[PDB]
RNA sequence: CCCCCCC
RNA sequence: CCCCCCC
RNA sequence: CCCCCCC
């Protein structure tokens, strides 16, 4: 059945159309040196409103890939959003859907903070501490990638995890910019990813275009590391299933587990059939996701969760254990094997 | 999963574009006999500012490979830096991005030192002690290659190691040039490698074009020796893992180590799949680096670090030991086997 | 319906 | 996130 | 870094 369902979904002669009357903003590569400034003036000043930081990160992505490539990416993502270009005025940027009041506020706040830290201090600002640093857009996109790995999770868990992991992953940027509010920027990125779902596709295309590069700075290598940490998002049950098989859990040989193993292997075969893009299904909110669910094998899922709980892997996972006896037996065996 | 991640990163139909509006300097081979002088006038005089010594070494590399080949190397490294040629004026060099005041200062300091060591002394300066010696650019690039092997490490460790190793590796040059400041030149090279990441690719291309040569002086053989000592930079955990396997550590047969051995072998298979260029991934800061991390196998990493600590190989390695009990058991077994 | 830990 | 010793 | 004896 599962192969037939995927065959129906894949073999479609008709293309969906959505967001027909909508538009979005991009910034041409000719403005990259400008957007960098903006992407850094968000980082070293303490701003009251961090509402459009995610849009500025996506603007930098658009400068990197190019306006035409970004339009093509949005078009092939199933969304008929018409790209609107970015202009300059007196210079500053007039990004579509980003209020000019916001850009002026961010620029003025950063200029005032820079003046205050230059007047009082000894005037020895290093090359990495200024807003026009060239890795500041990647530093903002690193907060974006941290909150990207938690798009399958909830908002509160995502924000808490982003802040916790960014105090260590982004320690160097925090030292360079003492006053960068990872919570508010992470909230902005979560809002962008939820509202504009095609920007998940744009962000993934940037991740690919960055990982495929021949050279990169440490910021881009960090961004790619986090982006790849997001790969199996929304499918931790499959990873824990292969973990359970590697652990040689005895309760995998139970009668009901052996009964469901056929369709479990069917799900894994479907994973292989989709191939490399299967991992990005839940990140993209591809409607085709959910063909990879193991919820139709309650006993296998309970055994997998029990094995994970025994090994300590389960952590604070919020999934359901359908069959509690199998869960407890598997947990006991996994603890015994671990000890 | 790891093979699929590498397949996504490798199979990209789009090329990244960075440093679009930026430019860099090269020196044509027709100026090599001139740049040599400069590359040696840094070595036998005591200069207040050693800021652009790395750029002068890279200029000599550009003379060696050629301006067009250097432009091609920069282009295939993922960076759209426009090469700017080097000119002469009254002769001395006007290198782009290198202030003429700096070049004049270095030349004047070297001329004054030469006059002082010729007026006071007996006037028996040998052929190797003069700035126009033809191995002086390679002597500077040897300090550059020493600090190249420490690009995965920190700045302070890199500088300390460079000075310590250069007092012995470069003893002959130090005898020839008593006043050459390995600390400041090493700092200059570290700054160049951090700022201009495409120059890592240029420096690697020089290493290849030198190792492939049919003949070479002792300076070039030393440079190639150090360059090859840099090969596995950023991946000492894989080298220590194969060391642990060679040591036949008993704790490799533990339950959790045997659990993680499958994906460990997956990482090693990915290493083989990338092939010869895998070692230069962390040296180049290739964003694709981090696919080779063994951080997702905490128990294997702890056992490997314990084995290294038992054999005395660990030295002062700053990596984390996730599971302390495995680390201590492996260290005890490794010491027992060593004794 | 699906998702949900850690890195 | 990754990296981190010695030669 | 490498090399280092004798014939």
HEC profile of chain B: CHHHHHHHHHCCCCCCCCCCCCEEECCCHHHHHHHHHHHHHCCCCCCCCCCCHHHHHHHHHHHHHCHHHHHHHHHHCCCCCEEECCEEECCEEECCCCCHHHHHHHHHHHHHHHHHHHHCCCCCCCCCCCCCCCCHHHHHHHHHHHHHCCCCCCHHHHHHHHHHHHHHHCHHHHHHCCCCCHHHHHHHHHHHHHHCCHHHHHHHHHHHHHHCCCCCCHHHHHHHHHHHHCCCCCCHHHHHHHHHHHHCCHHHHCHHHHHHHHHHHHHHHHHHHHHHHHCCCCCCCCCCCCCCCCCCCHHHHHHHHHHHHHHCCCCCCCCCCCCHHHHHHHHHHHHHHHC
CA distance readout (Å), A218 to A186, A225, B25, B250? 21, 10, 23, 37
Residue with tokens 């290093």: A126
Among residues B30, B132, B21, B164, the alpha carbon closest in space to that of B79 is found at B21
* Residues preceding chain discontinuities in chain A with C to N over 2.5 Å: 90
How many helices and strands, by DSSP H and E, does chain A display? 15, 4
Q: Are B279 and B235 in contact (CB under 8 A)?
A: yes
Residue with tokens 């003429």: B100
Q: Are A283 and A335 in contact (CB under 8 A)?
A: no
Q: Are B98 and B146 in contact (CB under 8 A)?
A: no
Q: CA A293 to CA A316: how far, in whole Å?
A: 20
Q: Are B62 and B93 in contact (CB under 8 A)?
A: no
Q: CA B47 to CA A317: how far, in whole Å?
A: 61
Reduce the DSSP state of residue A83 to 3 states and report it.
Answer: strand
| Closest chain A C-alpha to B151 CA, distance in angstroms | 11
Among residues A187, A188, A181, A139, the alpha carbon closest in space to that of A159 is found at A187
Q: What's the length of chain B?
A: 339
Which nucleotides of strand D lie within 7 A of protein CB? Answer: 1-7
Q: CA B212 to CA A189: how far, in whole Å?
A: 49
Nearest nucleotide to the CA of B289, by C1', is D2
Q: Which of residues 5-44 of B touch A (CB under 8 A)?
A: 5, 7-12, 14-18, 20-21
Is the CB of B169 within 7 Å of strand E?
yes
Q: Which value, to the nearest 10 degrees, does the dihedral of the CA atoms of residues B77, B80, B81, B84 take?
A: 110
Number of C-beta neighbours around residue A161 at 10 A = 16
CA distance readout (Å), B12 to A183, A215, A284, B8, B241? 33, 15, 18, 7, 31
Q: CA A223 to CA B301: how far, in whole Å?
A: 23
Q: CA B291 to CA B282: how far, in whole Å?
A: 11
Q: CA A45 to CA A41: how far, in whole Å?
A: 7
Q: CA B183 to CA B147: how far, in whole Å?
A: 10
Query: Do strands B23-25 and A92-94 pair parallel, antiparallel, or not at all (unpaired)?
Result: unpaired
Reduce the DSSP state of residue A29 to 3 states and report it.
Answer: helix
- Interface with chain A: mutation pick from B16, B193, B195, B267, highest number of A CBs within 10 Å: B16
Structure tokens at B196: 């201009």
Q: Which value, to the nearest 10 degrees, does the dihedral of the CA atoms of residues B93, B96, B100, B101 take?
A: -140
Q: CA B319 to CA B237: how far, in whole Å?
A: 9
Q: Are A40 and A12 in contact (CB under 8 A)?
A: no
Structure tokens at B283: 């040296």
Q: CA B242 to CA B265: how far, in whole Å?
A: 11
Q: Are A151 and A58 in contact (CB under 8 A)?
A: no
Nearest nucleotide to the CA of B168, by C1', is E1
Say how far B229 CA is from E2 C1', in Å.
11
Give A143's contacts (C-beta < 8 A, 6+ positions apart). Answer: A162, A166, A170, A182, A185, A186, A189
Q: Are A3 and A48 in contact (CB under 8 A)?
A: no
Q: In this structure, what are the phi and psi dihedrals at residue B17, rounded to the nearest 5 degrees? A: -135, 125
Nearest nucleotide to the CA of A318, by C1', is C4
CA distance readout (Å), B260 to A18, A243, B13, B294, B301? 45, 9, 34, 10, 10
Structure tokens at A257: 């587990």
Give B66's contacts (C-beta < 8 A, 6+ positions apart). Answer: B28, B29
Q: CA B251 to CA B307: how far, in whole Å?
A: 9
* Residues preceding chain discontinuities in chain B with C to N over 2.5 Å: 90
Query: Do strands A87-89 and A92-94 pair parallel, antiparallel, or not at all (unpaired)?
Result: antiparallel
Task: List residue ranges whose Cβ is under 7 angstroms from nucleic strand C.
Answer: A 149-150, 152-154, 157, 160-161, 164-165, 168-169, 229-230, 234-237, 239-240, 282, 289-290, 293-296, 313-320; B 295-296
Number of C-beta neighbours around residue A18 at 10 A = 12
Structure tokens at B297: 């196998």
Query: Do strands B87-89 and B82-84 pair parallel, antiparallel, or not at all (unpaired)?
Result: unpaired
Residues of A in contact with B21 (CB under 8 A): 32-33
Say how far A73 CA is from E6 C1', in Å.
73
Q: CA A112 to CA A116: how far, in whole Å?
A: 6
CA Rg, chain B, in Å? Answer: 23
Strand pairing partners for B84?
B25
Give A324's contacts (C-beta < 8 A, 6+ positions apart). Answer: A302
Q: In this structure, what are the phi and psi dihedrals at residue B25, rounded to the nearest 5 degrees? A: -105, 140
Q: CA A207 to CA B11: how far, in whole Å?
A: 13
Burial of A323 (0-12, 13-18, 19+ CB in 10 A): buried
- Interface with chain A: mutation pick from B287, B290, B291, B295, highest number of A CBs within 10 Å: B287
Is the CB of B175 within 7 Å of strand E?
no
Among residues A136, A143, A19, A9, the alpha carbon closest in space to that of A75 is found at A19
Name the experiment that determined this structure. Answer: cryo-EM
Resolution (A): 4.7
Residue A119 CA from chain centroid, whole number: 39
């Amino acid at each position: 059945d599962l192969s037939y369902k995927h065959a129906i979904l894949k073999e479609s002669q008709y293309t969906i159309k959505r967001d027909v009357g909508t538009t979005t903003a991009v910034t041409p590569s000719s403005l990259q040196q400008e957007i960098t400034l903006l992407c850094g003036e968000i980082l070293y000043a303490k701003h009251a409103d961090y509402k459009y930081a995610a849009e500025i990160g996506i603007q930098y992505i658009s400068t990197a890939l190019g306006s035409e490539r970004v339009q093509q990416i949005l078009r092939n993502s199933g969304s008929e959003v018409q790209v609107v270009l970015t202009r300059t005025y007196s210079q500053m940027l007039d990004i579509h859907g980003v209020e000019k009041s916001w850009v002026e506020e961010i620029d003025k706040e950063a200029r005032k903070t820079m003046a205050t830290l230059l007047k009082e201090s000894s005037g020895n600002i290093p090359q990495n501490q200024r807003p026009s640093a060239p890795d500041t857009p990647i530093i903002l996109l690193c907060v974006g990638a941290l909150i990207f790995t938690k798009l399958a999770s909830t908002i509160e868990v995502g924000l808490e995890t982003t802040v916790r992991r960014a105090n260590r992953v982004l320690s160097d940027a925090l030292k360079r910019y003492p006053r960068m509010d990872i919570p508010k920027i992470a909230r902005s990125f979560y809002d962008l990813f939820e509202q504009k779902v095609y920007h998940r596709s744009l962000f993934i295309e940037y991740g690919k275009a960055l990982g495929s590069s021949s050279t990169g700075s440490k910021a881009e290598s960090l961004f790619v590391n986090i982006f790849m940490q997001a790969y199996g998002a929304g499918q931790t049950m499959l990873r824990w299933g292969v973990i359970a098989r590697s652990s040689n859990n005895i309760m995998l040989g139970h009668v009901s587990v052996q009964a469901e193993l056929k369709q479990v292997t069917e799900v894994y075969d479907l994973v292989r059939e989709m191939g490399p893009e299967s991992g990005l299904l839940h990140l993209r909110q591809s409607p085709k996701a959910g063909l990879l669910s193991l919820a139709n094998c309650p006993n296998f899922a309970s055994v997998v969760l029990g094995n994970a709980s025994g090994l300590g892997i389960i952590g604070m996972y919020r999934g359901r254990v359908p069959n509690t006896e199998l869960f407890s037996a598997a947990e006991s065996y996994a603890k015994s094997l671990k000890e």
